[PDB]
Structure 1
C-alpha cells in the first residue's frame, strides 16, 4: 500500500523542526518529542498509519512516498562505517522515521546488533558478509527480520536519503496474506505452530521458529531463506512449498529519496536485489529503525522508545 505524501511537505518539514537537532545525544528526549509531534500528523496520513498499524494490509507494507528530504548536495557524504557519530545532525528522513515511528510504536535497539544503536545507516561496504545490509552485488535473500528473536520487532522501517546510482536496487517483500491461499490444507496445518530449527544472524552468534502461527485464518509469518533449517522431510517439504508461494507473490519497491517503507515484520519477508556501488561518496543510503508494539508480547511493560534489548532466542 502506498501513500503520496508530497502535499504534506510543508507540514512535515515543520513537525521535523520540532525535534532536537542532535538525536543520539539524548535519544529518549528526541523520541519523546517525536511522539508529541506525531499527534499532529496530517489527518489522512495519521489515519493510514493507524489503520495499517491495527489491520496490516494484504501486501504487508505501507510505502510513504514523496516525504521531504534534503537535496542530494545538502546531504552529508554517504557513511562509510557504523556506528554513526552520536553528534551527527538530524537528517530529515530520520526525522520522518521518528515521527512516523512513534505514531506506530517504540523504536527498539538490539544490543548485540550495530553497537546496540537504534538508527541504522544502511549503505554498501566493501567485502560485505552475504547476510548483511552492507551487501550490494549479491542478492540479500528473503528474511523476516530477526524472526528467531523473542523480542522481534513488529515493524522494520526503511527511509531513503539516497538510492543507488542506476537505481537498480529493488526492495522485495512477500506477504503471508497473498502467499497463504497458494498452500494447500495439509501444508498450512503442518506449518502452523510447528517450531523448526533456525540459525541466527552473525551478531547474535538454538532457536525454534514457527513458519506460521496465530489465527489459522490469518496467521503471522516467520521465514528466513537462509537460517530456517527444517529437519523432518515433511517439514522441509512444507517450507519449500511456502518458499515458492512467497516467491510467487513477491512485490518490488524501488526506494528513492523521500521514501519511507513500513514493513509489517510479522506478516512479511523481505529482500534486496543486486546493485553496484561506486564508492564515490554518494552510494545508496537508507535509514533503518525497528518498531515494537503491544502486539504478540513484544512488550512486558515499562518500555520506552529508544530502549535497547538483550537477545533471547525463541524456542
Structure 2
C-alpha cells in the first residue's frame, strides 16, 4: 500500500481553509487571473502542516507518485447544485469549496494551465458522466478509462493533475488507479529498461487535439535520469511499431498494472497526481442521471522544470497544442 506520508488528513484544518476560501472571488471565471492571484496569497497562509506536506511532495514527488488530501471542507450534498451535464461550465457559476481548494492548494504547487483545444480552453474542468461518452473521455463511466499519463504527447504536458471530489458515485465503486514508475521499475528487467529509456515512440493524441490523424507525436516511455526516470505511458494512444518496442512497452504495461493502487475519491478528497512519474485510470461505475452523479473538479499545474515553462507564464494561461517530436 501507499506510505503513511501519502495520505494527509486535513479535517483539523477545516475552519482555517474555509476562512481562506471566504476571501476568494465568488465568481472565479469572470476574472480567472485575479482569482488565482488571490489564491496564491492564500497559499502562503495554508496551515503549516499542509503547506509542508505539499512542498515536500512538490520537490521530487514520492515513491507512490501521488498525494491524497482527505477531509477538506466540502459542502453538504444538498447544498451543491445538480451535477453538471455539459462543458464548459457557465461563466457566472459561483465558486464551490472544492474548487477553492484546487485554487489555493494548486497555487502552492504551481501555475494552473488550460489547453486551448480541450474543453473550450477552460482551466477548471468538471469530470462527470455522460451517456454517450467516447471511450477515451473522462466522461466515461460503465467502461474503464484506461491508464494514461495526461497529455504525455503534448510539449506543454503538466507536472500535476489535480482531482477534487464534490460527489462520489452513488455506490462508491469508481476507483482512480495510480501506477507509479518508481514502484514499477524494479519489476522491469534491465534489458527492457534500456530499450524503453530515451527511445521516442509513435503516439496518437486525444480527440481534442486531432484538428484520427494517427501517431503525430513521439513519446519516450522512460526519460530523464535512467536511475529515476520519468514516465510517459498511454495504453490506448502509444503505438510502437518495431517488435522490440511493442515488447518493451508490454512489459512496462504489465509492471504498471502490478503496482497500481486504487484510490476511491469521496467528497472532500483531493488527489495530486505526479504526472511525470505516474499513469492513471478510472474503473467502471453506473451513473443514475438523478442529479447526484459523480462530480470531480480537475485542474492542471505546471512547474518550472522539464521545460514546462519558458518565461512570463501566469496561473490561468491557456496554451496551444504542439506535439512532442
TM surpasses 0.5: yes
Residue 264 (structure 2) aligns with: 254
TM-score, length-normalised on structure 2?
A: 0.97
Structure 1 vs Structure 2 CA RMSD:
0.4
Distance 2:56 2:71 in 1: 20
Distance 1:72 1:113 in 2: 29
Match of 1:203 among 203, 208, 212: 208
Distance 1:16 1:172 in 2: 29
Give the deviation of 1:295 after TM superposition.
Answer: 1.5
- Structure 1, unmatched stretches of 5+, are none
Residue 252 (structure 2) aligns with: 242
Matched, 1:169 2:169: no
Give the deviation of 1:127 after TM superposition.
Answer: 1.1
Distance 1:2 1:293 in 2: 22
Distance 1:290 1:55 in 2: 17
Q: How does 1:8-19 map to 2 (within 5 A)?
A: 8-19=13-24
Give the deviation of 1:144 after TM superposition.
Answer: 0.2
Residue 155 (structure 1) aligns with: 160
TM-score, length-normalised on structure 1?
A: 1.00
Q: Provide Cα deviations, 1:222-269, integer angstroms capped at 9, x if missing partner.
A: 000000000110101100000000000010000000000000000000
Give the deviation of 1:18 after TM superposition.
Answer: 1.3
Give the deviation of 1:55 after TM superposition.
Answer: 1.9
Matched, 1:300 2:305: no
Distance 1:127 1:238 in 2: 34
Segments of 4+ in structure 1 off by > 3 A? none
Distance 2:224 2:248 in 1: 17
Secondary structure of 1:248's partner? helix
Residue 101 (structure 2) aligns with: 96
Give the deviation of 1:184 after TM superposition.
Answer: 0.8
Residue 239 (structure 2) aligns with: 229
Distance 2:264 2:278 in 1: 17
Match of 1:47 among 49, 52, 60: 52
Residue-pair matches, total: 315
Distance 1:89 1:9 in 2: 20
